[PDB]
Amino acid sequence: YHEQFLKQNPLAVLGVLRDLHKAAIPLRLSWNGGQLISKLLAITPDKLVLDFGSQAEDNIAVLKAQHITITAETQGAKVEFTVEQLQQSEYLQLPAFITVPPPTLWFVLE
Secondary structure (H helix, E strand, O other): OOHHHEEOOHHHHHHHHHHHHHHOOOEEEEEOOEEEEEOEEEEEOOEEEEEOOOOHHHHHHHHHOOOEEEEEEEOOEEEEEEEOOOEEEEEOOEEEEEEOOOOOEEEEOO
């Protein structure tokens, strides 16, 4: 993507994630081997909580992947960032992924 759409400092990155959480649009988690549909359930300055996919084998694959690309788009605007690790946690009595904010984020307003 054009470098125009790059968010680099942690305040700007978190600001986009806050908007993404409130918009509550679907996310796509992609790794070397597959993809699944998720959602940003919760956000703090230190953590992201992501919904499990519907297929258990996808969630297991995503828990051992070493890089995960997260995408979300609506009305011509796309969010894209990569995290290095997801772990399994709990949220509202269901399993969930936990990760941490990326150091950079793409907010592509093409």
